[PDB]
């Protein structure tokens, strides 16, 4: 479908594993907000959008419908489970690297299905969690997902990183390396 | 490997030329298989696979559900676009342009929004296209993009290479030069 702008109002996901759901709105492929279902709280992902109001109850109601539909479909499909795809992992910096100027490492995990994944960061062989954050699962037109993880850092010759990705479609945790 | 059963519901709007042309497609998706959708161009639910046939049949038989779906293009899509006009569609972030050799010259254009951008390489006064390859748009996930545009060159004496960048956030092109 050709269009100047595409939006999802919203992307509703529910899956048996967990189980767990996710409610987001996307505009032109970027996440506007997500509803934290457990806390019943809307979380805006772009500052200018904080002036808006979206009642988390609306998302709870939709996710409840999905849960009911999923269970209807499992049986009718003769318990056809999700196929595990091989995700593709790419690691890059937000801006050109100059040593001693703050930057962000970005780990793009694409072609994710099913949407269950562990993305971690290793700083010199050991796991780190400070300065780490990530997007929700973002939708794609083939109905798989992508997710992006971030690591804030100060580039230096003496430090290298790996993005570590765990997913059922992989034989072993995939490790993507980065150096300045 | 544990099994997962996945359900997705996407409420999508496709905008062309503002809200002059708006198409709504809601998609119900089992695992990765779209099974039913409502396309405002068609005006009723249509099953996509046998799995979604009883849903479509059932949903279509409810005249009130149908009337609500038919009005959703105005109630949801055109309504939310008015919010986008004040926010997402006004967002302007200016690209940074940097030239670095990897022979192969790389022009990095980082941290811009929106997506519409044009990067050109020039050798002296003439555009290079034969020996140019650009990454696709790279989505940073935080409402900025970057793109890498690469030039294969055989630098002769006195050659001046120019990376030329046009983007809606600039009144004039950004130009950065490089000499062997």
């Amino acid at each position: 479908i050709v269009a100047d702008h595409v939006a999802s109002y919203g992307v509703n996901l529910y899956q048996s594993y967990g189980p767990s759901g996710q409610y987001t709105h996307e505009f032109d492929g970027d996440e506007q907000f997500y509803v934290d279902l457990g806390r019943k709280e809307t979380v805006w992902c772009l500052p200018v959008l904080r002036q808006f109001r979206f009642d988390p109850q609306f998302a709870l109601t939709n996710i409840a419908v999905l849960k009911h539909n999923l269970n209807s479909l499992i049986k009718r499909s003769n318990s056809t489970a999700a196929t595990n795809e091989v995700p593709e992992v790419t690691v890059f910096s937000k801006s050109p690297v100059t040593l001693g100027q703050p930057n962000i490492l970005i780990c793009l995990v694409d072609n994710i299905f099913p949407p269950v994944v562990n993305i971690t960061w290793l700083s010199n062989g050991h796991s780190v969690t400070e300065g780490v954050s990530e997007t929700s699962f973002l939708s794609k037109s083939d109905h798989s997902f992508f997710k992006i993880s971030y690591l804030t850092l100060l580039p230096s010759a003496e430090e290298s990183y790996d993005c570590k990705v765990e997913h059922w479609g992989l034989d072993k945790p995939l490790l993507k390396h980065w150096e300045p | 490997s544990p099994e997962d059963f996945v359900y997705q519901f996407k409420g999508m709007c496709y905008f062309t030329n503002g809200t002059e042309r708006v198409r709504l497609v809601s998609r119900s998706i089992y695992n990765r298989e779209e099974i039913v959708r409502f396309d405002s161009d068609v005006g009723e639910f249509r099953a996509v696979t046998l799995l979604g046939l009883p849903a479509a049949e059932y949903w279509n038989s409810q005249k009130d559900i149908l009337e609500r779906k038919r009005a959703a293009v105005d109630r949801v899509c055109r309504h939310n676009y008015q919010l986008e006009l004040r926010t997402t569609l006004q967002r302007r972030v200016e690209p940074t342009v940097t030239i670095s050799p990897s022979n192969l010259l790389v022009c990095s254009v980082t941290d811009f929004y929106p997506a519409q951008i044009k990067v050109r390489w020039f050798r002296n006064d003439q555009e290079e296209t034969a020996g140019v390859v650009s990454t696709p748009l790279i989505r940073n996930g935080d409402w900025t993009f970057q793109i890498l545009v690469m030039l294969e060159m055989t630098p002769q004496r006195g050659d001046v290479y120019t990376c030329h960048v046009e983007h809606p956030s600039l009144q004039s092109p950004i130009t950065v030069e490089w000499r062997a």
């Binding site: 109002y9 919203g10 509703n12 709105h25 506007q32 002036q51 808006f52 109001r53 979206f54 609306f58 998302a59 109601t61 939709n62 419908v65 999905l66 009911h68 539909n69 209807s72 479909l73 | 519901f9 409420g11 709504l24 809601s26 119900s28 009883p54 849903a55 059932y58 949903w59 559900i65 609500r68 959703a72 109630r75 949801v76 309504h79 939310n80 008015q82 919010l83």
Partner: peptide, 12 residues
Amino acid sequence: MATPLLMQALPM
């Protein structure tokens, strides 16, 4: 409005 609307999922 300062209120985004959403499309409602329907029960099967």
